[PDB]
Amino acid sequence: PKKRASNGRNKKGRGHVKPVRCVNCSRSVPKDKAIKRMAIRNIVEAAAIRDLSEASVYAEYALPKTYNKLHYCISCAIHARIVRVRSRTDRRIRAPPQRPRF
Amino acid sequence: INICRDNHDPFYRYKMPPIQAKVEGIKTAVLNVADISHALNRPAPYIVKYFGFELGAQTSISVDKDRYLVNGVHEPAKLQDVLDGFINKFVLCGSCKNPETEIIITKDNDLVRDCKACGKRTPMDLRHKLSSFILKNPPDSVS
Amino acid sequence: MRAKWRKKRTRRLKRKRRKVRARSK
RNA sequence: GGAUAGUGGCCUACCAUGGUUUCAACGGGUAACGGGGAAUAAGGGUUCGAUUCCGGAGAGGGAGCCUGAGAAACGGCUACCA
RNA sequence: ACCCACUCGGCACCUUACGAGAAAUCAAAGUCUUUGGGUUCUGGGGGGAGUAUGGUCGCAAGGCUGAAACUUAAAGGAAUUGACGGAAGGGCACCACCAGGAGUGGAGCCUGCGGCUUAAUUUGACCAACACGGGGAAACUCACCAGGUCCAGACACAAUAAGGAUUGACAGAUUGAGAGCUCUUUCUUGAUUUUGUGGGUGGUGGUGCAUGGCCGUUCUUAGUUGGUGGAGUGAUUUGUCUGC
RNA sequence: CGGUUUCAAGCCGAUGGAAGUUUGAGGCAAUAACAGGUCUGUGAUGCCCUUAGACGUUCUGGGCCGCACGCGCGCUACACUGACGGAGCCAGCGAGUACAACCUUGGCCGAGAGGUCUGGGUAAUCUUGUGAAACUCCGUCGUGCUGGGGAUAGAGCAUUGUAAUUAUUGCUCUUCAACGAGGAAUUCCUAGUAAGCGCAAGUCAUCAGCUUGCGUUGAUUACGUCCCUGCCCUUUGUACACACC
RNA sequence: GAAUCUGGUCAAACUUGGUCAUUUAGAGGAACUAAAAGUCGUAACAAGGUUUCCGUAGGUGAACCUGCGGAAGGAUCAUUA
RNA sequence: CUCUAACUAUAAAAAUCUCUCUUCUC
RNA sequence: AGCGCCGUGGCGCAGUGGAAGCGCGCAGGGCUCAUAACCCUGAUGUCCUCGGAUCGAAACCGAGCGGCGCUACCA
Numbered sequence A: 001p002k003k004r005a006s007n008g009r010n011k012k013g014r015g016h017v018k019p020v021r022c023v024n025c026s027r028s029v030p031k032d033k034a035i036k037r038m039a040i041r042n043i044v045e046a047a048a049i050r051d052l053s054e055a056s057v058y059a060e061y062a063l064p065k066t067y068n069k070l071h072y073c074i075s076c077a078i079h080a081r082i083v084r085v086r087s088r089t090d091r092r093i094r095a096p097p098q099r100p101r102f
Numbered sequence B: 001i002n003i004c005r006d007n008h009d010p011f012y013r014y015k016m017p018p019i020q021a022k023v024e025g026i027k028t029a030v031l032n033v034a035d036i037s038h039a040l041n042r043p044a045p046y047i048v049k050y051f052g053f054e055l056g057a058q059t060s061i062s063v064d065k066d067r068y069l070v071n072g073v074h075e076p077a078k079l080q081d082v083l084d085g086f087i088n089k090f091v092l093c094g095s096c097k098n099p100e101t102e103i104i105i106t107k108d109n110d111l112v113r114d115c116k117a118c119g120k121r122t123p124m125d126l127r128h129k130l131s132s133f134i135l136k137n138p139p140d141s142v143s
Numbered sequence C: 001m002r003a004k005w006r007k008k009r010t011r012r013l014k015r016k017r018r019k020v021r022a023r024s025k
Numbered sequence D: 001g002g003a004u005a006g007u008g009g010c011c012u013a014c015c016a017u018g019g020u021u022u023c024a025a026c027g028g029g030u031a032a033c034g035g036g037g038a039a040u041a042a043g044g045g046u047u048c049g050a051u052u053c054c055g056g057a058g059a060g061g062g063a064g065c066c067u068g069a070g071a072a073a074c075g076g077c078u079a080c081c082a
Numbered sequence E: 001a002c003c004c005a006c007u008c009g010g011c012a013c014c015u016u017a018c019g020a021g022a023a024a025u026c027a028a029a030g031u032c033u034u035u036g037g038g039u040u041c042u043g044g045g046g047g048g049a050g051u052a053u054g055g056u057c058g059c060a061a062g063g064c065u066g067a068a069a070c071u072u073a074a075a076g077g078a079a080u081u082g083a084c085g086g087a088a089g090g091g092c093a094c095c096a097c098c099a100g101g102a103g104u105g106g107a108g109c110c111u112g113c114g115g116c117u118u119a120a121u122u123u124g125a126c127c128a129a130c131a132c133g134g135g136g137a138a139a140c141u142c143a144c145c146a147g148g149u150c151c152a153g154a155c156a157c158a159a160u161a162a163g164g165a166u167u168g169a170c171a172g173a174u175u176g177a178g179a180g181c182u183c184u185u186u187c188u189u190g191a192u193u194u195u196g197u198g199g200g201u202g203g204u205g206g207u208g209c210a211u212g213g214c215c216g217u218u219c220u221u222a223g224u225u226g227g228u229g230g231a232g233u234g235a236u237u238u239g240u241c242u243g244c
Numbered sequence F: 001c002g003g004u005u006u007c008a009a010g011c012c013g014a015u016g017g018a019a020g021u022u023u024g025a026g027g028c029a030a031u032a033a034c035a036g037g038u039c040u041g042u043g044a045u046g047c048c049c050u051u052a053g054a055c056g057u058u059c060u061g062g063g064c065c066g067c068a069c070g071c072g073c074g075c076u077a078c079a080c081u082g083a084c085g086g087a088g089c090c091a092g093c094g095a096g097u098a099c100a101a102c103c104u105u106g107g108c109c110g111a112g113a114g115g116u117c118u119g120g121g122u123a124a125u126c127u128u129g130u131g132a133a134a135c136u137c138c139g140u141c142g143u144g145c146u147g148g149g150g151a152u153a154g155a156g157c158a159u160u161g162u163a164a165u166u167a168u169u170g171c172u173c174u175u176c177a178a179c180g181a182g183g184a185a186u187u188c189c190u191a192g193u194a195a196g197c198g199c200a201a202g203u204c205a206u207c208a209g210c211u212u213g214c215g216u217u218g219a220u221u222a223c224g225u226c227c228c229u230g231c232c233c234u235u236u237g238u239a240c241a242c243a244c245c
Numbered sequence G: 001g002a003a004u005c006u007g008g009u010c011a012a013a014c015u016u017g018g019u020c021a022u023u024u025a026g027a028g029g030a031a032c033u034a035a036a037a038g039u040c041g042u043a044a045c046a047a048g049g050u051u052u053c054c055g056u057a058g059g060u061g062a063a064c065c066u067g068c069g070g071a072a073g074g075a076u077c078a079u080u081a
Numbered sequence H: 001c002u003c004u005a006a007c008u009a010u011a012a013a014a015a016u017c018u019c020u021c022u023u024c025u026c
Numbered sequence I: 001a002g003c004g005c006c007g008u009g010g011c012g013c014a015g016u017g018g019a020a021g022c023g024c025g026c027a028g029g030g031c032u033c034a035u036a037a038c039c040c041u042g043a044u045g046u047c048c049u050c051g052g053a054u055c056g057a058a059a060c061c062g063a064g065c066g067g068c069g070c071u072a073c074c075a
């Protein structure tokens, strides 16, 4: 039948898109069927944020943050549990899962 | 000892010895592949891999150490007949049916039967898997 | 099955019959 | 012009370059004689029509024929092929 | 450049069914049996097969075109609830592990199986069979066997027959036998029987793959449902469920 | 009562009490199924078969108990926490004779198993307080396949039983093997539990390593997790629906 | 006014070869059906244990894999966390 | 009828199967 | 006629100075409802015949046997 209205692609009127590559499986993947994330994080692990702070010159520091736009294939992403299989009546909800922490 | 063919009963002609099989666990080691190989001017891998091609089962080939294992339950008649298909398709030439023909590549990659008595370049059945096998390993130079 | 390989097999058989023609003509 | 009961490239002679076509020509096939009709049946329709009626066509295959108003006749002929 | 209000055109999106669909769904897949805005091209079961063949284009790889014989009753679409999933998640079990404990498999013996053997090693079980059928049986029990008996063959009909339907038996042989089973010989007994048939009991005889009944397991887990009532044409589903 | 919970269901710790894991264990225990087993339990039986030299029944005897082998329940040992001579002396389940031979006490002979005379008991009286083992104490053995181990091979003595050979069972002596903790793998288990140890009762004429219960000595290590093996619920895809065999 | 016979004339027909249709054997060559207890592996249906499938090209006992491009018929309709 | 923030990381091998398919009525 | 090689448990190689070696064989067991894969445990032997060396020689050497690879038909 039809798995999805958008055919799990989200192209819908673009003819073609230049492919990107997965971070993990490293496959050529259409940029829209290319589930991807902002793995925003501070430069240091949350555990040692104390020690480093008093282990350094230049008090009242900023503690920079490292960023990356990670492109995940379908297979790797579904494998690493970062995307969850869902019921069809549950699949369609495109809203992000409501701000993991608050 | 065979007269190098099956449906051919002369008293004078070039000779081939029969091949046999011993058991391993299961896979049969064939004792007499190098001698027939030298009697047909064709390397042993062609014999073994042709037998496999008409057979359709996993096989093991090791020319440096004489352990030619072909997997399956094959009575003497079956493998001697597959090798008969080998010699008729490969070893013997057209006109005189010479049991010594070499396999030669011209400037084109036309793998061809070449003889000595009639000496023709018999149009080879490149439409067989053993043709690709032979072209993969040039004779007496990549073995 | 894999109709990929069936189509390729048909193409190869046609190629072989064409080359048999080429030798025979 | 000839020829024909009489038109007409019917045939000839001199010329002229034309005629037909995707609106299906020409070629191929037709276990097709065409029709009146038959079967079938809400209506629309599908198939069959060698065969009682109509026409047309044949007398083994082609040709040629006198006679006769009317014949290219075949229970009339001239010839070849079978 | 922004916000408001309206709109034109474009990709789309959310709800809904008002329709329509084989449904999955679709704002067109609607305005389609209440059958008819105009429109070009396609397919008529699956294979055989995009195959053969003849073209055609091509340097070639190959494309466009394109069968039939034959062969089969299904192939197939959506959709259902189960089963499955080295798929995901939520909880479980000492018939799972972990921590360890104690052992089994090593030794001998006993018992139970299989296979070999013999007449037979009677047989049924192959997680839920195997110290089980109380299967720890010297007879039996017994279902195995070499033998020996006996009828515990009703009832009915026919059948004989009181000058005998018939049974029983000391002794010898014969049989282990002290069995009158069999004989040799005689005596006893009397109408219950005896011999045929119709019909009949017994059968640890066969068939648990004909069955009951019984208990085993599935399965000690948490699972199972119907009456309205709703959601689907239905098969069904919900009630049985988001969480804790 | 104190924690912990949208403050709800409840959960955790402590106090108190015998009992604070559903107090402990059990037994009753759903729908639907299986081609599970059993006709060998029946006087439950269908159907088929045999029914007189019988597959019925009975009598004898042989057989169910044999062995080039393998696997699977168990028992005793592989020794020093031991074994052995003696002493010390704690239990609970039970059971036990009628139309007949049970429970055995006590006293007598035997070294023993046994045998005799009596005695009570149809059962809280009698066996009984089953004087059970394991266990403890005091001696001996001294790390040696040796007093561990005792299979097995000889001879005899007893008892039950119509009948013990193919050793019934018990006893006496001699023989004393293999056994040095056991490959791959696998089973069981969380508290009076595991383990050892015995007792009883079913089977029983007579025989237990069997089993059902009972009690004795009395635990290391948790108080968890889905890694293996499964299970339950939910989601999900299936071309599976004889269901991953 | 017959025979014979000049011409042409319609022209059947015969030979000769070309050319075609249909049957037609045919050394040998290459396939497909049905037969489901042949053999080797297990390609696929689940994430089929390397996602499938398609076009293309090479190789590969066989399945198929491989490189490049695709599509969801996928196992993702989903990051203004 | 007034809120816009945190966050991690496995992928070892598993190949296969010839069974019977059975019936619903007041 | 002489020199270089060898002497298996069923087969291929090896260490030959502590005395029967592994893979592959095979009998059996383990695993799985089942088969394989795997896991493991076991059985065959006179490193050729006889001596020297050595505590001990299959083994270092030798006084030869059987078989091989060259010289090459060597009056």
Ligand SMILES: [Mg+2]
Pocket (backbone or CB within 6 Å): A003
């Ligand atoms: Mg799908």
Ligand SMILES: [Mg+2]
Pocket (backbone or CB within 6 Å): A008, A009, A010, A032, A033, A034, A035, G076
């Ligand atoms: Mg997506």
Ligand SMILES: [Mg+2]
Pocket (backbone or CB within 6 Å): none
């Ligand atoms: Mg025509």
Ligand SMILES: [Mg+2]
Pocket (backbone or CB within 6 Å): D032
């Ligand atoms: Mg017609």
Ligand SMILES: [Mg+2]
Pocket (backbone or CB within 6 Å): none
């Ligand atoms: Mg007509």
Ligand SMILES: [Mg+2]
Pocket (backbone or CB within 6 Å): none
């Ligand atoms: Mg007419």
Ligand SMILES: [Mg+2]
Pocket (backbone or CB within 6 Å): D068
């Ligand atoms: Mg007239």
Ligand SMILES: [Mg+2]
Pocket (backbone or CB within 6 Å): D072
């Ligand atoms: Mg005519």
Ligand SMILES: [Mg+2]
Pocket (backbone or CB within 6 Å): D073
């Ligand atoms: Mg006429």
Ligand SMILES: [Mg+2]
Pocket (backbone or CB within 6 Å): D074, D075
């Ligand atoms: Mg006429």
Ligand SMILES: [Mg+2]
Pocket (backbone or CB within 6 Å): D076
């Ligand atoms: Mg006439």
Ligand SMILES: [Mg+2]
Pocket (backbone or CB within 6 Å): A013
């Ligand atoms: Mg556009």
Ligand SMILES: [Mg+2]
Pocket (backbone or CB within 6 Å): none
């Ligand atoms: Mg079709």
Ligand SMILES: [Mg+2]
Pocket (backbone or CB within 6 Å): none
């Ligand atoms: Mg098709």
Ligand SMILES: [Mg+2]
Pocket (backbone or CB within 6 Å): none
């Ligand atoms: Mg073409």
Ligand SMILES: [Mg+2]
Pocket (backbone or CB within 6 Å): none
């Ligand atoms: Mg638990």
